[PDB]
Amino acid sequence: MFKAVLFDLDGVITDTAEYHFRAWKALAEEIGINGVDRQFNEQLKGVSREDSLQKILDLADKKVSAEEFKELAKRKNDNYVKMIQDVSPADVYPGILQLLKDLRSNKIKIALASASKNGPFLLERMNLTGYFDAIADPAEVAASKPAPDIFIAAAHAVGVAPSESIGLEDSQAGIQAIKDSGALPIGVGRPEDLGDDIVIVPDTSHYTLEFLKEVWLQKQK
Numbered sequence: 001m002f003k004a005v006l007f008d009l010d011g012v013i014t015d016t017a018e019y020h021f022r023a024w025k026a027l028a029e030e031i032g033i034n035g036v037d038r039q040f041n042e043q044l045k046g047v048s049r050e051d052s053l054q055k056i057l058d059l060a061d062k063k064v065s066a067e068e069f070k071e072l073a074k075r076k077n078d079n080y081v082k083m084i085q086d087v088s089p090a091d092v093y094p095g096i097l098q099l100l101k102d103l104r105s106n107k108i109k110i111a112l113a114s115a116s117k118n119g120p121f122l123l124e125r126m127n128l129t130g131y132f133d134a135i136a137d138p139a140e141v142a143a144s145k146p147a148p149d150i151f152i153a154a155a156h157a158v159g160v161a162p163s164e165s166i167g168l169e170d171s172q173a174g175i176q177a178i179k180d181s182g183a184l185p186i187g188v189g190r191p192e193d194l195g196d197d198i199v200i201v202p203d204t205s206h207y208t209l210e211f212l213k214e215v216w217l218q219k220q221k
């Protein structure tokens with residue numbers, strides 16, 4: 001049986017989108033730019049801070065200096081840190097808490113393989129820290145997803161080879177990283193987005209220990 005589960009954070013454990021939305025909306029209002037609504041922020045999913053800021057300035061056809069741009073990006077991050085203080089166990093996605101409990105009670109290792117530089121804090125806010133055996137530090141990988149670096153690091157940090165592990169991901173780049181690490185991917189979402197050659201569940205309530213075990217056994221035949 002698999003010895004570890006490597007968890008992505010955003011789109012698997014929780015969603016940070018509302019908090020990023022709040023942060024951009026606060027910044028936009030401060031500098032007097034209309035149009036930063038929930039719909040607009042949906043289009044920033046997966047998009048870098050710098051590219052996102054440019055999209056906000058584009059709402060007002062606005063140009064700024066390199067220094068001003070840097071300062072605005074910093075201010076957005078300061079806003080985001082404020083907004084995520086309100087993260088709580090209510091933010092945890094369905095099924096995830098029960099899965100973490102079942103993995104730990106069965107002595108299966110649990111690691112975080114997230115791009116979030118606020119991962120440890122977010123886990124603390126959601127009361128999940130005690131379930132995690134390791135957190136792979138994104139600041140430490142030479143290459144981001146789809147590079148497998150972060151999943152390899154997560155597996156190694158809990159004393160396992162990636163080949164002994166399952167990775168859970170909501171993004172196509174994430175699924176690729178899991179595949180190229182040697183771990184077994186189980187995606188959450190749709191094949192149109194993630195690919196047609198992996199096991200996918202429609203939402204996280206399907207991520208049960210029983211299901212993960214069935215998939216593991218089915219995949220080594």
Ligand code: BEF
Nearest residue numbers: 008009010114115
């Ligand atoms: F937290 Be993962 F990188 F979406």
Ligand SMILES: [Mg+2]
Nearest residue numbers: 008010011170
């Ligand atoms: Mg994700």
